């Protein structure tokens, strides 16, 4: 008769549409630069690792992605991460107290691009409506991230593997706001070297708009999510 035996471990996460890039919703509009507006860095195509993590790259320093038609380095440019969508291979995992999570299948170096946070791009009003409807339906998983005050990415209905990354108070990745072809997008970047097999986490820096309990396990855990 066991309450322990009532095995309701979902064998798979609830459905979502796995998408490559953000999808604008309602009033939210498409932001695209003219090729004439893309910043050009001063890296040289002869450089070792042109526009790389260790480089002086003026674009990378200001979190601007290079456009290959613009960059002096051509297709050798190592600052095309968002557009190339080269992500370390990742795997969805089941946790006991934090739902589904995500782990890396390979080793990742400090500062390396891990993923793009993609989803439906919605305005504040739509964000609030969605949160209200979620509370009315006793939903406890939220996938909303503010890019700017009226541009919020909702990775709930549609997203990529980044939607599975859990919150940690002592994370191994962080979000950064980058400009890519005149649009503001959100990347996840490693804060440290990460061995293959490790769960990938970031600090949500949550604006709660009461608190949810945090199970991240960190020594500095506040006890509360975000």
């Amino acid at each position: 008769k066991e309450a322990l035996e009532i095995e309701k471990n979902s064998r798979k996460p609830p459905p979502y549409k796995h998408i490559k890039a953000n999808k604008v919703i309602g009033k939210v509009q498409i932001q695209v630069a003219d090729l004439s507006e893309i910043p050009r860095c001063n890296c040289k195509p002869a450089d070792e690792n042109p526009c790389g993590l260790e480089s002086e790259c003026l674009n990378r320093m200001l979190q601007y992605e290079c456009h290959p038609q613009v960059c002096p380095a051509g297709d050798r440019c190592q600052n095309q991460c968002f557009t190339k969508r080269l992500y370390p291979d990742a795997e969805i995992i089941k946790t006991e107290r934090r739902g589904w999570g995500l782990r890396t299948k390979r080793s990742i170096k400090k500062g390396e691009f891990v993923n793009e946070y993609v989803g439906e791009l919605i305005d504040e009003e739509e964000c609030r409506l969605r949160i209200k409807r979620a509370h009315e339906n006793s939903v406890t998983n939220f996938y909303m991230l503010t890019v700017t005050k009226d541009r919020i990415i909702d990775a709930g209905p549609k997203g990529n593997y980044s939607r599975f990354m859990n919150h940690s108070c002592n994370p191994n990745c962080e979000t950064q706001k980058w400009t890519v072809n005149g649009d503001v997008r959100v990347g996840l970047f490693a804060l440290c070297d990460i061995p293959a097999g490790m769960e990938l986490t970031f600090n949500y820096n949550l604006d709660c708009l009461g608190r949810t309990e945090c199970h991240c396990g960190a020594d500095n855990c506040s006890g509360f999510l975000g």
Partner: peptide, 5 residues
């Protein structure tokens, strides 16, 4: 709540 960068 909503995540922030």
């Amino acid at each position: 709540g909503v995540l922030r960068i």
